[PDB]
Design an enzyme around this catalytic site. Structure first.
Site, short mmCIF file in Angstrom:
data_model
loop_
_atom_site.label_atom_id
_atom_site.label_comp_id
_atom_site.label_asym_id
_atom_site.label_seq_id
_atom_site.Cartn_x
_atom_site.Cartn_y
_atom_site.Cartn_z
N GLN C 227 0.82 -1.20 0.00
CA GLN C 227 0.00 0.00 0.00
C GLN C 227 0.87 1.28 0.00
OE1 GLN C 227 -3.34 -2.21 2.76
NE2 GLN C 227 -3.43 0.03 2.66
N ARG C 374 -9.91 -0.51 7.62
CA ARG C 374 -10.66 0.70 7.56
C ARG C 374 -10.81 1.35 8.91
NH1 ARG C 374 -14.59 0.69 2.16
NH2 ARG C 374 -14.30 -1.51 1.73
N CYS C 375 -9.74 1.38 9.71
CA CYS C 375 -9.81 1.98 11.02
C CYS C 375 -9.41 3.44 11.05
CB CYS C 375 -9.00 1.24 12.01
SG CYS C 375 -7.23 1.40 12.00
N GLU C 750 -13.01 4.86 4.34
CA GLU C 750 -13.15 4.13 5.59
C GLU C 750 -14.42 4.44 6.33
OE1 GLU C 750 -9.28 5.42 6.70
OE2 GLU C 750 -8.88 3.32 7.35
N1 LIG Z 1 -14.47 13.28 -1.82
C1 LIG Z 1 -14.23 12.09 -2.43
C2 LIG Z 1 -13.55 11.08 -1.74
C3 LIG Z 1 -13.22 9.98 -2.42
N2 LIG Z 1 -13.62 9.80 -3.70
C4 LIG Z 1 -13.12 8.71 -4.43
O1 LIG Z 1 -13.22 7.55 -3.66
C5 LIG Z 1 -12.00 6.76 -3.72
C6 LIG Z 1 -11.45 6.55 -2.37
O2 LIG Z 1 -10.79 7.76 -1.95
P1 LIG Z 1 -10.34 8.06 -0.45
O3 LIG Z 1 -11.56 8.15 0.42
O4 LIG Z 1 -9.38 9.17 -0.56
O5 LIG Z 1 -9.62 6.70 0.01
P2 LIG Z 1 -8.27 6.05 -0.48
O6 LIG Z 1 -8.23 6.08 -1.96
O7 LIG Z 1 -7.13 6.63 0.29
O8 LIG Z 1 -8.52 4.57 -0.07
C7 LIG Z 1 -8.15 4.00 1.19
C8 LIG Z 1 -9.32 3.32 1.80
O9 LIG Z 1 -9.94 2.54 0.84
C9 LIG Z 1 -10.89 1.63 1.41
N3 LIG Z 1 -11.58 1.04 0.31
C10 LIG Z 1 -11.04 -0.02 -0.37
N4 LIG Z 1 -11.67 -0.36 -1.54
C11 LIG Z 1 -11.05 -1.32 -2.24
N5 LIG Z 1 -11.60 -1.69 -3.41
N6 LIG Z 1 -9.90 -1.87 -1.86
C12 LIG Z 1 -9.28 -1.61 -0.71
O10 LIG Z 1 -8.16 -2.15 -0.37
C13 LIG Z 1 -9.85 -0.65 0.12
N7 LIG Z 1 -9.33 -0.28 1.35
C14 LIG Z 1 -10.19 0.56 2.20
C15 LIG Z 1 -9.25 1.21 3.17
S1 LIG Z 1 -8.71 0.26 4.49
C16 LIG Z 1 -8.87 2.56 3.01
S2 LIG Z 1 -7.74 3.19 4.13
C17 LIG Z 1 -11.06 7.49 -4.71
O11 LIG Z 1 -11.20 7.06 -6.06
C18 LIG Z 1 -11.58 8.91 -4.65
O12 LIG Z 1 -11.34 9.71 -5.78
C19 LIG Z 1 -14.42 10.73 -4.29
O13 LIG Z 1 -14.89 10.53 -5.45
N8 LIG Z 1 -14.70 11.92 -3.66
#
Ligand SMILES: Nc1ccn([C@@H]2O[C@H](COP(=O)(O)OP(=O)(O)OC[C@H]3Oc4nc5nc(N)nc(O)c5nc4C(S)=C3S)[C@@H](O)[C@H]2O)c(=O)n1
Ligand SMILES: Cc1cc2nc3c(=O)[nH]c(=O)nc-3n(C[C@H](O)[C@H](O)[C@H](O)COP(=O)(O)OP(=O)(O)OC[C@H]3O[C@@H](n4cnc5c(N)ncnc54)[C@H](O)[C@@H]3O)c2cc1C
Ligand code: FES
Ligand code: FES
Ligand code: FES
Ligand code: FES
Lengths: 286, 158, 796, 45, 152, 161
Positions: C227, C374-375, C750
């Site tokens: 990651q 997801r903590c 998360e």
């Molecule tokens: N305001 C926002 C926030 C997010 N997004 C979209 O949603 C997605 C997730 O964004 P974000 O919330 O920033 O999270 P991360 O990309 O940093 O993902 C990490 C998060 O992702 C989660 N979802 C998962 N989903 C999949 N398929 N796989 C994992 O390993 C996952 N792990 C979990 C865990 S644990 C975590 S920590 C991104 O494409 C982002 O552009 C959006 O459209 N608008």
């Protein structure tokens, strides 16, 4: 994940499979759908030296009515059981039960015979077969014999089969038309072996139960045929006092494992609840 | 080693395998068809699902020698010869039926068979019908939609 | 050209799906390199024992076996232990003793995984049992076994010059004196001990790598389930002595991570060492049982949680002490200064004057981890603590818990809101969301329905009970500001580099790493809007440490807060340069130009314009003399604060008291993550996270028995719902932008799990509240809910 | 070691130095990667 | 032509250019330019060319242009890094940038040579303790439009 | 296809080859020993030189079948197992005897044999002795130096300057 090495055989006939098993000995195992055996080989709980795949033996597959019985070949898959409208007309409990076994992939491969012969008390078919008073047809080097399903199971992975024998068919008496039936299973999710399950077949006349038979799944080291519990229903209206008696007599014979599905005491009670619910559904079907 | 001959994605395959080689390893390691995945060691997840002689099979719970003479379709075999995605592949994309992609090959391969078993399934039939396939990412809801979308497309072809 | 943009807010279909739907992803186990071997571990059958001897001779002698490493082989390279993110060390191969069942003891390297498995069975280990410690509540007793002999001496109490030998850390925050004073006089004190049981992120793809040391070049290539691939590079450098420019880490497609793939595992180290020793590539791929039992667990917090209140329901203080079970080594991922993560967000969505939190971490004979699944760095725990405490307080107050929350919410005008344990929330409109949610589910009507159902129960008319679960939560995601957030000394920024080609297409890379969250789709949407360049004209890459700008990886929902911000800022650097090119081309002052979707126009002469595409070409073809050619930019974004998305989740649960079987009737999830880049992707993130929440609350667990045997660590028992068990999800939103974020976007991934678990648990607890069950500890599976009812006398 | 300025400069192997070539390690061992060395699955000629 | 130079936390470097060697030793010599500019040993620097996804756009190697164009860009990009490094040093050493002098591989405080930061230390600092006004990291790009040819 | 068994870089090799397969292509395309190169189509350049039964051979002018039973050394076989480069490999680097590297495998393999033929060659003997190997980049002067360096290393004493 990775099994120990083995040699693989594809006998063309029952006779050749029996001869092979007899020759190779205890280190040889029949391979039917593989969905109990391969998993334990992958854990190395089972380390057979030879697998005798029954796949090419056509005579082990099929569903027919013969006299007062339905005879199902051991290699008939769960998917085939479910698909048989003929079997659903005569023994609708089988489809109901099979749909509660495993998942689609497993049901494509898993066989009735392997379910019955496996000896894990998690399997559903054993207690159903006890409920139905099925007989298992075994063929070995010394010839054919029949063992009642009610007499077949002694413990976890301990059954009445003898060295060199194959379970070739299951012979199931056909209940009367209009009989009530149900298989009620409590499980943690799809694919899970029962916390407890009950198989019931019964018949009614004039508002009274004429016949009843009950099997209990995965609430002892074997399936159980709940003889006393079924007898107490006979002659009753299948009302609360009668169900309470049957529940008592069923619970009394359980001796469940304490595992991820819960402690023994819970599972005993769940045998009872499944039983009640199965009787109710069977009554309504009757 | 045993000599096997079978068909995978419409092509003849011949190989020498140890009997203990699991079908999923044969497919991935010897045949280099790495679309199928391994997600478990107990036969639960369905990520290794292939279509084999008209059946959905968990290829981690079968030895390659058992597939001798079989016809297998893997995810690589789903697209049309001209590259066009199958209805299921397209539906999974259109309906956001995947995220990490790890279950997807198995999900699509199972679904391919599902829609042959029942071309017009209800949602309950879909959910039960994919009960052998785990997904960590999607919560299944869009997978249902994907399958429904594919059914509609298929059902519109003829 | 409108149809082509597919920018921000669009439900842009995912570019990743093309390959993944066709089996053309590239996951680690898909990698095949010339000469590549396979390695795996001989693992401990004992939870706690000295290793008397390890006989590897039969294994080495087996044909196809190339090496069998033991700690003896690693010690000289100072690799028998590896550093953790938590500042401890973890044993790579067991040296003197084993400390958890399934711990790595030897690493067998063989021609393939079949031979490796055979050889593992030939290794013979002799063990001398030591007393097993599994109950963290007993970890600091005077007779508790000395687990970590490598770093601790015996210290049997809490008043010595070192902490108890099984005590990892004590961390406290907030105003103790003030909190204690409030509790000493408050009208109501509501106390419970909530256990957040050990679970596991269980990604469908397990942890795995392919290490390839090229001995001719002196360069290491390492493919793996990372990651945070740049972090892994730096750590591999510090511990191996190879310089970073000669370590090429590649995180390819990853089959889910869910926090399981942040840190390093012994398998990575051993594959690397083996490859270095052998000079050929070494693949390591773990099986599920080892994934579940030896990689990062999640949760395992025992939270003594108290709220002080007035009888009318005003919350005056919160006092929480946590006993954290970290297993044998503290490998808990976290910013280095935060040994209990952001558990100090546990005052939640409520305006409370004062609070105090204490956390003690202890060693036990279990696998390591803690932060995963997801903590958001212990925010799951924080939110569970507060949202459960709200409910137990409301019971004690004889108040509806919705009304209790409403009475206590931080109000929109209070943002940015400095909470009593130190976090400053960025923005939030809690009353509006709560109202929208309550109205949508018909809350007051549900309560009347519930009351009638309860009366029916008491009259013997039904065996079903109804619970209404509420979880109103404030997340904290986007770690984080350099002042206080670092991973082993690297500040928790992230990054983007964007390069526009002469013909107007783009390559952009980021310091994050998707494991299915759709970054390759969504980062391009940000750029598309910023520059007027169609999203399909933009290629997004992550995970190759040689090519992507340094970043801290994807976890903590941080990608959108950090690299999403960097993306926008980098794009804005490009836009500013384009504006200068346009001014040169149009012979005007830059100030005379305005941006209009995809072009700069001369104010008041809108007919005179230059498009972004034209500017890109000009930057190569006719670069203004004052400026460098080309059109590209980088940004490393140090966030000024975290983002604080929130949500209002409502669960209606029906429970059969005779079997314990619970069935979700309806689950409504409102999430507000500010500006929404891709609503389709967010919805999928929510569906997935809510399904995890369901699983955690209703069935999932990893347990240990008194002998230290790990229980339930396979899919035979570990509850992963299928499509049949997984509820239908109803999702909703509000939009409350993050004021400090370049596009107002907060993280969200998360949130569903964080909010979902308390929602489910609250529903279960609520169902039984009329029967005075008290706090029912998760998971709420059938046997445990049967036991609740059994103990209440419901079965006779 | 507290190297002198001159020692530090020398260690750089920077501008003006007869620095030996990094490329030679692979090329002297036949581990260059020239076009005809490339082999891809399914590649035709 | 062009150069992009990125310094890793631990002080090694990846640098790429828009030229393409066919045996002229660029992988050796570009690193020499960087080494002198930054006080990072050449062996700590990896040079790449030729992958259009990764290298900054350039016009290639012919016309003996690589040293005039990308060699220039390499120096200019490296000077951008040095300028940032000097800012980091001033922050860490609590002096003004004008109070610093370069001594091969470190900035020392004028008159107080015992007060210094090496480029290696600065690289780590850029990731570990970025001065509040600066972005983290330590990297640069230059696209160099030459003012004239060179006339050897 | 013909069955062949031989030894390459000290390891047994068994293969099936078409008779018309050039040895260079068997080495490069079947054995994946891609150090040897093809520079020409008329047997002039020597880029394909391998050491074969104690001879320097242009492997583009031999069929793989002709090498049945042979012992071949290619450039991949020159370095010691411990990683240390051979004297020639080291000399080529030390003396700047290569630029593009394309002739280098064949130059080194030729030179390996040259220095067995004549462990202490004069400059003229070196130049003549590598006459079958063309280089485009170096103008040969540093190649000569490299070979001299290697000889001196092997011999423990220098000869010419
Ligand atoms: N305001 C926002 C926030 C997010 N997004 C979209 O949603 C997605 C997730 O964004 P974000 O919330 O920033 O999270 P991360 O990309 O940093 O993902 C990490 C998060 O992702 C989660 N979802 C998962 N989903 C999949 N398929 N796989 C994992 O390993 C996952 N792990 C979990 C865990 S644990 C975590 S920590 C991104 O494409 C982002 O552009 C959006 O459209 N608008
Ligand atoms: C994930 C999962 C979930 C499952 N869930 C359920 C469930 O809910 N309920 C349930 O009932 N089953 C369940 N099963 C087990 C499944 O139904 C198996 O198919 C069944 O237990 C064995 O039948 P088989 O044909 O696969 O036999 P095999 O696995 O091939 O054989 C099992 C055993 O029986 C022996 N054997 C097989 N055929 C014969 C024969 N004709 N004569 C003598 N010996 C024979 C074998 O030698 C072996 O010892 C599950 C399996 C899996 C993998
Ligand atoms: S890999 Fe999980 S069922 Fe096959
Ligand atoms: S898409 Fe990730 S496991 Fe299903
Ligand atoms: S390739 Fe030129 S002589 Fe062989
Ligand atoms: S080094 Fe280029 S041909 Fe000789």
């Amino acid at each position: 994940m990775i099994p120990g090495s083995f040699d693989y055989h594809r006998p063309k006939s029952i006779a050749d499979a029996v001869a092979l098993l007899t020759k190779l000995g205890e280190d040889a195992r029949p391979l039917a759908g593989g969905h109990s055996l391969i998993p334990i080989m992958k854990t190395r709980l089972a380390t057979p030296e030879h697998l005798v795949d029954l796949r090419d033996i056509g005579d082990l597959v099929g569903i027919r009515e013969e006299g007062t019985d339905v005879v199902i070949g051991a290699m008939t898959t769960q998917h085939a059981l479910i698909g048989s409208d003929f079997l659903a007309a005569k023994l609708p409990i089988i489809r109901e039960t099979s749909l509660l076994i495993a998942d689609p992939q497993i049901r494509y491969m898993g066989t009735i015979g392997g379910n019955a012969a496996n000896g894990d008390p998690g399997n559903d078919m054993p207690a159903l077969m006890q409920c139905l008073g099925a007989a298992y047809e075994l063929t070995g080097p010394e010839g054919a014999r029949i063992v009642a399903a009610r007499d077949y199971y002694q413990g976890a992975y301990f059954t009445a089969i003898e060295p060199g024998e194959l379970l070739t068919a299951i012979r199931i008496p056909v209940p009367p038309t209009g009989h009530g039936y149900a298989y009620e299973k409590l499980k943690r999710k799809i694919g899970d072996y029962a916390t407890a399950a009950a198989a019931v077949v019964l018949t009614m006349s004039g508002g009274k139960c004429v016949t009843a038979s009950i099997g209990l799944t995965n609430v002892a080291n074997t399936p159980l045929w709940a003889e006393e519990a079924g007898k107490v229903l006979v002659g009753t209206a299948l009302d609360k006092p009668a169900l309470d008696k049957a529940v008592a007599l069923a619970e009394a014979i359980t001796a469940p494992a304490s595992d991820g599905r819960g402690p023994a005491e819970y599972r005993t009670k769940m045998a009872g609840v499944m039983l009640r619910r199965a009787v109710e559904r069977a009554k309504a079907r009757a | 080693k045993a000599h096997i001959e079978l068909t995978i994605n419409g092509h003849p395959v011949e190989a020498l395998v140890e009997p203990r080689t699991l079908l999923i390893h044969f497919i991935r390691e010897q045949q280099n068809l790495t679309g199928a995945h391994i997600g478990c060691d107990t036969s639960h997840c369905g990520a290794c699902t292939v279509d084999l002689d008209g059946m959905s099979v968990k290829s981690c719970t079968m030895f390659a020698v058992q597939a001798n003479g079989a016809s297998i379709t893997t995810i690589e075999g789903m697209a049309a010869p001209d590259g066009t995605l199958s209805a299921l592949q397209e539906g999974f994309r259109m309906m956001h039926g995947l995220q990490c992609g790890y279950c997807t090959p198995g999900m699509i391969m199972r679904s391919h068979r599902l829609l042959q078993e029942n071309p017009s399934p209800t949602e309950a039939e879909i959910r039960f019908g994919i009960g052998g396939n785990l997904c960590r990412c999607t919560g299944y809801q869009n997978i249902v939609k994907a399958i429904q979308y594919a059914a509609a497309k298929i059902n519109g072809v003829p | 050209r409108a149809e082509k943009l597919q920018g921000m807010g669009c439900k842009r279909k995912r570019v990743e799906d093309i390959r993944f739907t066709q089996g053309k992803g590239n996951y680690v186990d898909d990698v095949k390199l010339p000469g590549m071997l396979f390695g795996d571990f001989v693992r401990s059958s004992h939870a706690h024992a000295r290793i008397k001897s390890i006989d590897t001779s039969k294994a080495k002698a087996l044909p196809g076996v190339f090496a069998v490493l033991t700690a003896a082989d690693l010690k000289p390279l100072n690799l028998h232990y590896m550093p953790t993110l938590a500042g401890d060390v973890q044993a790579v191969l067991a040296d003197e003793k084993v400390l958890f069942q399934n711990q790595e003891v030897a690493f067998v390297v063989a021609k393939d995984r079949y031979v490796a498995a055979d050889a593992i069975e030939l290794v013979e280990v002799d063990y001398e049992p030591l007393p097993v410690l599994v109950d963290p509540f007993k970890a600091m007793e005077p007779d508790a076994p000395l687990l970590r002999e490598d770093i601790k001496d015996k210290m049997t109490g809490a008043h010595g010059a070192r902490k108890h030998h099984n005590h990892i850390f004590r961390w406290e925050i907030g105003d103790k004196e003030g909190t204690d004073a409030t509790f000493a006089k408050a009208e109501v004190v509501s106390k419970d001990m909530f256990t957040y049981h050990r679970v596991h992120p269980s990604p469908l793809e397990t942890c795995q790598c392919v290490a390839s040391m090229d001995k001719i070049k002196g360069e290491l290539t390492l493919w793996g389930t990372f990651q945070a691939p740049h972090v892994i590079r730096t750590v591999v450098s510090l511990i191996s002595g190879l310089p970073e420019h000669k370590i090429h880490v590649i995180a390819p497609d990853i089959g889910g991570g869910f926090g399981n793939k942040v840190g390093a595992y012994s398998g990575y180290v051993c594959a690397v060492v083996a490859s270095i020793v052998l000079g050929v590539p070494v693949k390591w791929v773990e099986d599920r049982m080892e994934n579940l039992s030896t990689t990062s667990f999640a949760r395992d917090y025992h939270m003594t949680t108290e709220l002080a209140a007035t009888k009318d329901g005003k919350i005056l203080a919160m006092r929480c002490h946590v006993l954290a079970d970290h297993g044998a080594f503290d490998a808990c991922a976290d910013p280095s200064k935060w040994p209990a993560g952001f558990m100090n967000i546990c005052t939640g969505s409520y305006d409370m004057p004062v609070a105090h939190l204490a956390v003690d971490g202890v060693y036990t004979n279990k696998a390591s981890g803690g932060v995963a699944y997801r903590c958001s760095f212990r925010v799951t725990e924080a939110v569970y603590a507060i949202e459960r405490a709200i409910e137990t307080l409301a019971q004690r107050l004889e108040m509806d818990s919705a009304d209790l929350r409403i009475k206590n919410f931080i109000q929109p005008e209070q943002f940015p809101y400095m909470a009593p344990l130190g976090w400053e929330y960025d923005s939030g409109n809690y009353p509006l969301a709560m109202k929208k949610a309550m109205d949508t589910v018909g809350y007051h009507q549900l309560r009347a329905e519930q009351k009638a159902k309860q009366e029916a129960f008491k009259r013997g008319e039904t065996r079903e009970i109804m619970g209404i679960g509420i979880s109103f939560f404030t997340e904290i995601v986007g770690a984080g500001p350099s002042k206080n957030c670092d991973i082993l000394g690297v500040s928790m920024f992230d990054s983007a580099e964007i390069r526009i080609h002469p013909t107007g297409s783009v390559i952009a890379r980021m310091g994050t790493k998707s494991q299915g969250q759709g970054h390759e789709t969504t980062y391009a949407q940000i750029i598309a809007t910023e520059l007027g360049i169609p999203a399909d004209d933009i290629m997004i890459e992550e995970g190759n440490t040689d090519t992507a700008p340094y970043g801290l990886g994807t976890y903590g929902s941080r990608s959108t807060p950090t690299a999403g911000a960097a993306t926008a800022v980098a794009a804005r650097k490009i836009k500013a340069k384009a504006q200068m090119i346009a001014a040169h081309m149009l012979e005007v002052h830059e100030g005379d130009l305005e941006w209009d979707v995809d072009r700069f126009r001369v104010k008041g002469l809108p007919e005179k314009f230059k498009t972004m595409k034209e500017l890109a070409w000009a930057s190569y073809n006719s670069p203004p003399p004052n400026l460098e050619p080309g059109l590209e930019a980088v940004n490393y974004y140090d966030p000024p604060n975290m983002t604080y998305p929130f949500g209002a989740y409502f669960c209606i649960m029906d429970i059969d008291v005779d079997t314990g079987v619970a069935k979700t009737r309806r689950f409504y999830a409102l999430d507000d993550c500010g500006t929404r880049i891709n609503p389709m992707i967010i919805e999928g993130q929510v569906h997935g996270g809510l399904t995890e929440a369901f699983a955690v609350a209703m069935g999932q667990e990893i347990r240990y028995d008194e002998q230290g045997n790990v229980l339930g660590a396979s899919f035979m028992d570990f509850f992963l719902p299928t499509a049949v068990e997984t509820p239908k999800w109803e999702t909703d939103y509000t939009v409350t932008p993050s004021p400090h974020h370049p596009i107002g976007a907060k993280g969200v991934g998360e949130s569903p799990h964080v909010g979902g678990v308390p929602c489910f648990s609250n529903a279960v607890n609520d169902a039984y509240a009329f029967l005075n069950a008290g706090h029912i500890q998760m998971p709420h599976d059938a046997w445990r809910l049967w036991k609740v009812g059994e103990q209440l006398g419901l079965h006779v | 070691v507290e190297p002198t300025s001159a020692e530090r400069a020398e260690k750089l192997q920077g501008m003006g130095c007869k620095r030996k070539r990094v490329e030679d390690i692979r090329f002297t061992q036949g581990k260059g990667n020239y076009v005809d060395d490339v082999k891809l699955p399914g590649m035709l000629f």
